[PDB]
């Protein structure tokens, strides 16, 4: 496992969950069994570390 960076465009891979973007802070309370997040267009929006 690599280091954690924020506000930097990075290739990221969270247990197979790929994607490249900038990681910020959010307040969207996830459920304990909920792991990933999507939106209306099925776009990965919020992710739990």
């Amino acid at each position: 496992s690599t280091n954690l960076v924020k506000n930097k465009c990075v290739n990221f891979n969270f247990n197979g969950l790929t994607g490249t973007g900038v990681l910020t802070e959010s307040n969207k309370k996830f459920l304990p069994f909920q792991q990933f997040g999507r939106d209306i267009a099925d776009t990965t929006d919020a992710v739990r570390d």
Binding site: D39, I40, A41, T43
Partner: peptide
Amino acid sequence: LLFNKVTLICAQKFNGLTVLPPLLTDE
């Protein structure tokens, strides 16, 4: 009333479907 009626805004901008802002702003 119109603006509060009509409501997606950025959910279709994350896949390369960039939306050019209007040359003329809303105001």
